[PDB]
């Protein structure tokens, strides 16, 4: 009802102060997808939060 669970398809290294770095296979909760391209996400694996490139993730159980 607000859960938006995605899995990282590849690694992504942060390159701004607001990006989230993640490893392939991490599960993420999508907090805000307002921008369309870059989504605010929270890692279920690491507990870190930040923007992610939406093309690097796919919906997951």
């Amino acid at each position: 009802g607000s859960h938006m669970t995605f899995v990282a398809l590849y690694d992504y290294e942060s390159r701004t102060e607001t990006d989230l770095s993640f490893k392939k296979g991490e599960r993420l909760q999508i907090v805000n997808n307002t921008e369309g391209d870059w989504w605010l996400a929270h890692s279920l694996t690491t507990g870190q939060t930040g923007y992610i490139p939406s093309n690097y993730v796919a919906p997951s159980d």
């Binding site: 590849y10 690694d11 992504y12 391209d37 870059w38 490139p53 939406s54 093309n55 690097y56």
Partner: peptide, 8 residues
């Protein structure tokens, strides 16, 4: 804009 990165 901020383009998305290319995919590996």
């Amino acid at each position: 804009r901020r383009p998305l990165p290319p995919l590996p």
